[PDB]
Design an enzyme around this catalytic site. Structure first.
Site, PDB file in Angstrom:
ATOM      1  N   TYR C 109      51.616  40.696  42.840  1.00 38.77           N
ATOM      2  CA  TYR C 109      50.478  40.422  43.597  1.00 38.77           C
ATOM      3  C   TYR C 109      49.508  41.538  43.596  1.00 38.77           C
ATOM      4  O   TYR C 109      49.830  42.677  43.907  1.00 38.77           O
ATOM      5  CB  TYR C 109      50.810  40.269  44.999  1.00 38.77           C
ATOM      6  CG  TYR C 109      49.534  40.287  45.800  1.00 38.77           C
ATOM      7  CD1 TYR C 109      48.910  41.466  46.185  1.00 38.77           C
ATOM      8  CD2 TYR C 109      49.058  39.097  46.339  1.00 38.77           C
ATOM      9  CE1 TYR C 109      47.808  41.458  47.035  1.00 38.77           C
ATOM     10  CE2 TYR C 109      47.956  39.057  47.192  1.00 38.77           C
ATOM     11  CZ  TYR C 109      47.331  40.250  47.546  1.00 38.77           C
ATOM     12  OH  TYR C 109      46.233  40.204  48.410  1.00 38.77           O
ATOM     13  N   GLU C 197      41.653  38.701  45.016  1.00 41.17           N
ATOM     14  CA  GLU C 197      43.058  38.472  45.183  1.00 41.17           C
ATOM     15  C   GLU C 197      43.679  37.717  44.054  1.00 41.17           C
ATOM     16  O   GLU C 197      43.416  36.529  43.843  1.00 41.17           O
ATOM     17  CB  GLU C 197      43.400  37.928  46.544  1.00 41.17           C
ATOM     18  CG  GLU C 197      44.644  37.064  46.517  1.00 41.17           C
ATOM     19  CD  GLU C 197      45.220  36.851  47.893  1.00 41.17           C
ATOM     20  OE1 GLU C 197      46.027  37.840  48.271  1.00 41.17           O
ATOM     21  OE2 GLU C 197      44.992  35.853  48.572  1.00 41.17           O
TER      22      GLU C 197
END
Ligand SMILES: CC(C)(COP(=O)(O)OP(=O)(O)OC[C@H]1O[C@@H](n2cnc3c(N)ncnc32)[C@H](O)[C@@H]1OP(=O)(O)O)[C@@H](O)C(=O)NCCC(=O)NCCS
Ligand SMILES: CC(C)(COP(=O)(O)OP(=O)(O)OC[C@H]1O[C@@H](n2cnc3c(N)ncnc32)[C@H](O)[C@@H]1OP(=O)(O)O)[C@@H](O)C(=O)NCCC(=O)NCCS
Lengths: 288, 388, 388, 288
Positions: C109, C197
């Site tokens: 991530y 993101e």
């Protein structure tokens, strides 16, 4: 017959594609002499029982075919088209719809300089009822006959056909020039052939809102064609400057109207039909 | 696709073309801020709508004071502008252009399109600035000079000079103009446009050339390769339906009458409408069924056509098809109920399975009419509607 | 402002980041056609809406055949997708992304934001790839690693290694990962983003790093200098009442009670809202009156408020202003009428001339209450609605 | 008093433009020692009976001014906070709304670095009642007193004020800290200033969702603030991920919520008032 006959050997570009396939099937079933197809990468295999090549050059060398249909998507189209010309096809019929005018525009040129014939694009294609099929043209409606037809629109055509068919007439060849603003072949280009086709006793000309095309033809016509022609134009109720589905169907600067178009033929001495349903009729006459 | 003035200007700039200093505002506050970003008044404030006739409409105005600006914006954002080129309820104003006022010596006219007839992009100019050429040409046709881009070489300077002189410019002006033509000639090609219109091309008192206005059109077909353009689309400017249609491979265009048409193919569609008016009908729309007349597809059509509460009947007319006549019938029926069409329906099937289809149609019990022949259906519809 | 997955991808490409082969579609046909411009699949089809967790929602899918694809698209284009982050009334799907499948080795991530506390742009990263980080963080906060961009130098590569290694990468991944860090770090500042993101950022089987997903948020406040993104905005994604509002310099925001508020000021409002609940009531919207509480402005304020028919009252609280007690009441009245608001409306006028106005209100003869006190008003309206 | 007083000299940036003008007439009228403004390119003119410069620097010299107010458009704001720091102003107060965060993010740094002080942005400002004012604050409602106010939001503030007036107390100074996610001086800075102000006998701190300064303010206070304080927070009824008018007024994936804040304050042992209303009410308590 006008462009294709039973001796015409064909190949398909984008053969293994979806449209390519389906349609190929039928041509195949209709007796069209599909000699094979082209799908880059898939050279080596056989589709529909026919061989598949990586290049047109290849295919040509191998089959001596001289015609080609293209089921290739807008974006890649021009490439194929060039390719073909380049390989020595003399007749092209591209079906694809979604072709950037600039592309075509540059393409016509090449066609000309090169002496190649393309029908289209974004058109049903051609069928010489009884001998040869190319396009989404639907089989069983035609009857081998003395009528010749050109049209900018596909479906309409089917009407016509039906009539001449029920009216006994039959068709020599059926020509769907396609509905883009810039075609490979136009009224004239064809008419001229009809005029010289022993089998074509009379013609049906079909067009809509759009360019001059029609106008331009009349001209020609009047002073260049002897056989009789019944003509019809779609778009009377059309709005100004709105693309009516087919890309090339639009009223530019208050220019390209149904009426104009009509007027214009009648002058050239053309049997004008206000109603679509009347083609059979009208003919009858001019045909007696 | 059309673009906005502002977007056009922005591009011109990206290319080096001359335009006013301006800022597209979205709120009276930004609007009123631009003025002093721009400097000394007075300034120009234009509504960014895709139609022309903006001026006559009242959406273009020269202003003297910050507040004056606030006002205009206030007055227009949110509302819908209506020009002679606009529909009836017009288009929506969501932006406003704020630029510097220009010192106007002359008004020229520059533009490009694709000449179908000659299969070329032609650029054309004329001295008659600040007037619609369709006119101009319509009557002083000799006031237009034209040139055609060669596909083989691109566009060349001689061609620009050419017109420049044809226009009777001199000196740097000539140099300048060249520049521009070359300028646009390229964009045209670079971005796959279809059309350009700088009207007026202006000459300033200070004696410079500058694009007072810009109007472009891009080739829908190439979007797939013009992502910049792509992003610029302003759906807010067109009939939403049209958009829905597309989302279902349909080609919709709304009209004026009371009779819905749904047909399989552009040609037909027009011809069909035509035949109807012929039979005294009033087509209320153009619909061209691009996918396979599947249920959902037909259903979707239905909604759409029916969006316009004016329509009093619908004429379906199918001819070729990848779908079996009977098949479609079903859906139509289906369709009729799913949606809930409380309007008579005339149907003209053809092709395969045709009789079976009409029958099913009939045995249906709904208010559907399988039409005998084309022209029959025609009547029938005109019929039913006229009933009233 | 947020951006569509395809939109970020585009960007990322323009920055040279890895992301998959993909095309954005606006028609089945289109979508359907990518499959091959893409090559063999299978491939992935993503609805494109701003919200996340499109997956669960089933707005995502891997697929095996043109046909299939062509269906998905058929299925969803034009419909709204509803996710956990949507609104009981999903976001509208106008496009779908078609992309190549990928062999997921590992999912990390990677994301970043402006840390208000520390005041820096922070990038954090973790191996808890594929999961809603809020969670991970909240429950195991030590699996996030962060760095802060130093505003003096900018992003340095040594920061990128740091994380790469914290995530325990080795070999080229390290260098690749580093790459991106810088990549994004650049866009961040260059494009004035507010958030990024990538979830996830994956290690493919083949051993490389690619950005499988992407979510960007742009600094609204900076658009002025960021014309590109300006163009990317997609209103479809948002409450239209929102922009309408803005164009009026209103700060509107749909909530859920049945008591409406028009307040002068972000601060005031929320308090106001707050008090209402506090006394029983339950407000349905946020309403920051931006410009001068001018008739027109107020009127809209109402119009907008009342778009929600579940509303059964309006509370108006007006303190300061650059207007005047009265001038205001007037405008209210005025509003009330024109709009034609049938529900009871309560008013607290503040300070300046406030007495006259209240009088003017009670004298109007509409359903307007001049709440005396703030809290009072509060009450009043709560009843008012309670009344049933 | 805090930050400002009657002695304080002011000059405003953007003075000429709209708001600048207006708001000025007022500070002026209220007796703020306005002393001139700046508007590049307009130096050497007078405005509002004041002298205009072309440079913070010019003017600072020529006037001995020490704090400036800015009414400069967002997209120039930074060349301004910045320029002012350079001309060595000690007190900046930036009203402007809409500044991109990243700009602020850097400025904050410079400001710190330079040891300069700025309040804002996107804020009402400050005033030291009867003494002096800068900002869009409104007059006649304040009264010299022992209350010190701080708020991340302006309108609210009016209410408090009002209250503290009405209950008789009055106020030392009230500070608008602004609604931006990252502001010149935060809670603590100002808090600190208060605890050390003799005139200030108590505190009202006004916060709102999104963020953590309040949270941070607590603890600070807790261990560094003697004087008693009263705190009202807002946005309890507000929703996640949504901006509520003010830019830094949003809830970042579950953080900066109003209760959360309210709590935090309690622990630092503050007088949490859940009703903007009983603001004064609560004081009376503590303020006795
Ligand atoms: C041309 C068109 C039909 C393609 O549709 P399709 O058959 O579904 O397309 P597909 O992707 O399905 O297949 C086309 C093939 O072209 C192949 N291809 C691509 N570029 C090629 C090229 N230069 N030469 C040869 N084949 C090529 C592709 O590889 C694909 O075959 P595949 O899937 O083996 O690999 C589409 O653009 C279209 O329909 N245009 C207009 C449609 C229409 O409405 N026609 C009626 C008006 S006449
Ligand atoms: C900055 C702001 C106040 C502009 O207000 P405005 O007066 O309408 O803007 P105007 O264009 O009239 O005036 C701005 C002036 O700045 C001047 N200016 C521009 N750049 C400048 C610079 N670097 N230095 C100084 N002045 C400058 C302009 O020249 C203009 O004055 P001018 O007319 O003499 O040219 C605007 O961003 C704003 O209103 N922000 C938020 C307002 C608000 O809600 N405040 C309360 C909540 S905190």
């Amino acid at each position: 017959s006008i462009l294709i006959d039973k001796n015409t050997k064909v190949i398909c570009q984008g053969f293994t594609g979806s449209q390519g396939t389906f349609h190929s099937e039928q041509a195949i079933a209709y007796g069209t002499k599909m000699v094979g197809g082209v799908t880059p990468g898939k050279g080596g295999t056989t589709h529909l029982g026919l061989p598949v090549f990586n290049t047109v050059r290849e295919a040509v060398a191998a089959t001596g075919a001289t015609a080609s249909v293209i089921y290739v998507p807008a974006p890649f189209c021009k490439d194929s088209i060039l390719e073909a010309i380049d390989a020595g096809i003399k007749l092209i019929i591209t079906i694809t719809e979604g072709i950037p005018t600039l592309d075509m525009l540059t393409v016509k040129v090449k066609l000309d300089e090169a002496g190649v014939r393309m029908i289209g694009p974004n058109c049903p294609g051609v069928i010489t009822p009884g001998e040869c099929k190319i396009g989404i043209q639907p089989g069983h409606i035609h009857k081998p006959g003395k009528v010749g037809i050109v049209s900018r629109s596909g479906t309409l055509t089917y009407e016509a056909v039906k009539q001449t068919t029920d009216y006994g007439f039959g068709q020599s060849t059926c020509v769907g020039i396609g509905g883009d603003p810039i075609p490979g072949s136009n009224f004239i280009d064809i008419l001229e052939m009809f005029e010289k086709d022993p089998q074509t006793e009379a013609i049906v000309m079909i067009g809509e809102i759009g360019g001059s095309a029609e106008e331009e033809a009349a001209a020609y016509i009047k002073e260049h064609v002897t056989k009789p022609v019944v003509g019809y134009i779609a778009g009377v109720t059309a709005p100004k400057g709105k693309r009516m589905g087919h890309a090339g169907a639009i009223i530019a600067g208050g220019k390209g109207t149904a009426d104009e178009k009509f007027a214009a033929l009648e002058a050239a001495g053309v049997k004008t039909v206000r109603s679509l349903a009347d083609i059979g009729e009208a003919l009858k006459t001019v045909l007696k | 696709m059309n673009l906005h003035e502002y977007q056009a200007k922005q591009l011109f700039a990206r290319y080096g073309l001359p335009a006013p200093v301006g800022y597209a505002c979205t709120t009276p506050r930004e609007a009123e801020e631009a003025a002093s970003k721009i400097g000394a008044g007075p300034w120009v404030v234009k509504c960014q709508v895709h139609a022309g006739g903006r001026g006559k409409a009242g959406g273009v105005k020269v202003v003297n004071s910050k507040e004056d600006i606030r006002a205009f914006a206030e007055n227009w954002l949110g509302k819908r502008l209506v020009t002679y080129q606009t529909d009836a309820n017009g288009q929506p104003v969501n932006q406003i252009l704020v630029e510097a006022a220009t010192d106007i010596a002359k008004e020229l006219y520059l533009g490009a399109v694709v000449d179908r007839s000659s299969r070329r992009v032609v650029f054309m100019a004329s001295t008659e600035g600040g007037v619609e050429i369709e006119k101009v040409a319509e009557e002083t046709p000799h006031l237009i000079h034209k040139v055609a881009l060669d596909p083989l070489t691109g566009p060349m300077p001689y061609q620009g000079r050419e017109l420049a002189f044809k226009l009777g410019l001199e000196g740097k002006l000539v140099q300048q103009f060249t520049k521009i033509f070359m300028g646009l000639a390229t964009i045209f090609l670079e971005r796959d446009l279809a059309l350009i219109e700088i009207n007026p091309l202006v000459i300033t008192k200070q004696g410079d050339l500058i694009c007072l206005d810009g109007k472009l059109g891009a080739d829908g077909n190439a979007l797939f390769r013009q992502p910049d353009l792509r992003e610029m689309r302003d759906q807010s400017q067109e009939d939403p339906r049209e958009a829905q249609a597309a989302q279902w491979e349909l080609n919709y265009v709304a009209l004026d009458g009371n009779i819905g048409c749904m047909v399989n193919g552009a040609g037909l569609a027009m011809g069909t409408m035509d035949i109807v008016k012929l039979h005294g009908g009033e087509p209320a729309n153009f619909l061209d069924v691009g996918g396979g007349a599947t249920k959902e597809r037909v259903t979707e059509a239905f909604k759409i056509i029916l969006s316009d509460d004016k329509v009093k009947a619908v004429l379906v007319n199918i001819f070729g098809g990848i779908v079996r006549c009977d098949l479609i019938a079903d859906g139509i029926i289906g369709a009729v109920a799913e949606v809930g069409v409380n309007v008579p329906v005339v149907v003209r099937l053809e092709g395969n399975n045709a009789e079976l289809g009409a029958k099913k149609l009939a045995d249906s019990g709904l208010n559907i009419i399988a039409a005998k022949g084309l022209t029959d259906a025609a009547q029938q519809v005109v019929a039913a509607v006229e009933g009233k």
